[PDB]
Design a protein around this ligand. Structure first.
Ligand SMILES: NC(=O)C1=CN([C@@H]2O[C@H](COP(=O)(O)OP(=O)(O)OC[C@H]3O[C@@H](n4cnc5c(N)ncnc54)[C@H](OP(=O)(O)O)[C@@H]3O)[C@@H](O)[C@H]2O)C=CC1
Ligand SMILES: COc1cc(-c2cc(C)cc(C)c2)cc([C@@H](C)C#Cc2c(C)nc(N)nc2N)c1
Length: 225
């Protein structure tokens, strides 16, 4: 009932997302997008959830966690069950799947969550291809003089483009209404792939905010009683 949206920054063409437990770039504008999208709501009485794997949690600077103004959920197989408050702003879960089911309960949530963002990292995203309704992907490209950074963790692009299509024509409409983006929508070829979305440049990179949406599905079965 509430949308589940994976949100990720990935370097084309392999969709690398990390190296040695850290982000491979430090891009203040990309970080401001991530901050605004995950914080902002259309309805002022609601908040978003951000769900993350334990290793991703551990990498957020201690000063800056839990991420303000959002319900933070950290998942670890060493935690107690499926959604437990552990501190102000912090829930622990031992299951990505059961966590999402628990968050969807209208009785538990009082319909006061807008969206559930899955914010990383590699192992969490792998498991989220069949759970997310959408992906907000920032597609990052080194500008011609820029050294490609080393990376060790990747988005599963095959399974992405299996299940989802590039819906970036609708990105503006999908973002919380109050966000303001600097680009206009823009389709560019880059190493043999079509890159469509909202352009920024910062430091040695160009990046596009893009939206992926689930492909239409055939009606094979609906469960009857
Ligand atoms: N570019 C981007 O947009 C982002 C990139 N990243 C990058 O990703 C990398 C980190 O990814 P990765 O190492 O895969 O780690 P994760 O952040 O995905 O955390 C993995 C941990 O999550 C727990 N976990 C995984 N699946 C489940 C499950 N189904 N139920 C309960 N717990 C689960 C386990 O914790 P435990 O071991 O305690 O049981 C596991 O070790 C880093 O390099 C980081 O920089 C991260 C976020 C965003
Ligand atoms: C591995 O280390 C991490 C560090 C941070 C982090 C670093 C600083 C300096 C400040 C703050 C508040 C957080 C965030 C993350 C995670 C949670 C992220 C992210 C993410 C981004 C930046 N962009 C898109 N598009 N999607 C995403 N899911 C991981």
């Amino acid at each position: 009932k509430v949308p589940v949206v994976g949100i990720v920054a990935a370097l084309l063409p392999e969709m690398g997302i990390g190296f040695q437990g850290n982000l491979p770039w430090r891009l203040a504008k990309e970080m401001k997008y991530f901050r605004e999208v995950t914080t902002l709501t259309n309805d002022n009485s609601k908040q978003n959830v951000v769900i993350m794997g334990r290793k991703t949690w551990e990498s957020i600077p201690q000063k800056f966690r839990p991420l303000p103004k959002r319900i933070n959920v950290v998942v670890s197989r060493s935690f107690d069950g499926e959604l437990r408050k552990v501190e102000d702003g912090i829930y622990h879960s031992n299951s990505l799947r059961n966590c999402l089911t628990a968050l969807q309960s209208s009785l538990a949530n009082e319909n006061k969550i807008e969206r559930i963002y899955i914010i990383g990292g590699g192992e969490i995203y792998r498991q989220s291809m069949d759970l997310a309704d959408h992906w907000l992907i920032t597609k990052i490209m080194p500008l011609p003089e820029t050294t490609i950074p080393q990376m060790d963790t990747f988005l599963q692009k095959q399974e992405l483009e299996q299940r989802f299509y590039d819906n970036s024509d609708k990105l503006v409409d999908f973002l919380p209404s109050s966000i303001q983006l600097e680009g206009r929508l823009t389709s560019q070829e880059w190493n043999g792939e079509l890159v469509k979305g909202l352009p920024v440049q910062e430091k040695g990179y160009q990046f596009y905010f893009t939206l992926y949406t689930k492909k239409l599905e055939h009606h094979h079965h609906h469960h009857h009683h």
